[PDB]
Design a protein around this ligand. Structure first.
Ligand SMILES: [Hg+2]
Ligand SMILES: [Hg+2]
Ligand SMILES: [Hg+2]
Ligand SMILES: [Hg+2]
Lengths: 123, 124, 123, 123
């Protein structure tokens, strides 16, 4: 069992507009997801989207946010096995620290061998 | 409002042993957490620990896992404002993809300006 | 701030069929919900639907369960401010124990004073 | 598989003081939990405790709330297999509506048979 846990905004999107319905896709990143799906990886979209607007209220995110996510994922033929909302929002200046984390430009640029290598170096 | 969201196993720990009580600290990473706390950043420990063992049951994780995490964090003087369990487990071969993610070796060796640069280069 | 936390199956529905899209509404209970909404109560639909099927995987409930919940709620004109999925599944013989809990027939048949009296007895 | 989903304050406790560490147990309710535990019922303590104080922030509840819940459950010899926090807070006048819900003094006074009877009247 192997999953990719994939952020939505800025990772699968170009984050060019506040209108989530019409945000531009990052095509190279999405195409890489497809190749990983072919390799047996499950794809989990995990996102903090609208955690700021609703002050962490998942009950509201489930109503106003989820529909537009799925609609957008479908329109751009992004493969996904799961969607998860309510991810902790780091804030404007915040960020995530993780030994198994890659940035979307590294994911698009590297094969599995050399992603494995990035991680082994940490260990 | 600014937060670091920090993984536990492999980021704050050297992952040298299955005994979580007695696992060795990554001292350079923790020391960097202290400097960021000084800058006004809130520290959130977020972990998938025991998601495999309990098959996703946070009801059990709350009982068996949380006490040992806090005890360990306290023992090693790790600053934290929040703990969050129930992070999605990626499996042995899985990983996270995120435009705001840094690995613990990058976090330990770069300043804020430098981290900011990694991210800005992602936007074009 | 005052909230009704409302179960879905067997409370807002008659639980007459496993086909959630076409399941019959409990009209009296829904209408009482309309009154409480007018009185300033936030309405939170909380449900364990498809927890059994997906074995607690909300990643999948978000994809396959949520759309049908909202479509149904919308067509039967149920007031709601929040939907919450991922509620613990009690199993067939299991149940819920809460000092502030009413069953749908009690809610349908009593007024606010009466319900408060039901709880004041508990104290 | 069969589960009791049990609320904490006012159900397992007498809710006589805001000092959770020294709050009185409802001995009859706890003793009934033990009998259900003997019959093969899993016991899930589920609670909104400290959701008001921390404004829904589970990251804080895990730190300041869980240890005290656990020490108290252990002290009063309460059987449990799971603790769930972060349950939605109904507010002062709010309440829960569920077709499988019993109040803690219905649980205390009835046996399994009549509790099932209590539910088949709703069905
Ligand atoms: Hg951020
Ligand atoms: Hg992994
Ligand atoms: Hg049940
Ligand atoms: Hg309440």
């Amino acid at each position: 069992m192997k999953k990719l846990i994939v952020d939505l905004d800025g990772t699968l999107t170009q984050a060019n507009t506040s209108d989530y319905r019409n945000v531009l896709p990052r095509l190279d990143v999405i195409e890489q997801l497809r190749e990983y799906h072919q390799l047996g990886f499950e794809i989990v979209i995990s996102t903090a989207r609208n955690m700021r607007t609703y002050e962490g209220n998942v009950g509201k995110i489930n109503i106003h946010t989820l529909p537009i996510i799925t609609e957008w994922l479908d329109k751009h033929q992004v493969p996904y096995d799961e969607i998860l909302v309510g991810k902790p929002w780091c804030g404007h200046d915040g960020f995530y620290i993780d030994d198994r984390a890659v940035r979307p430009s590294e994911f698009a640029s590297m094969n599995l061998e050399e992603i494995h290598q990035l991680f082994e170096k940490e260990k």
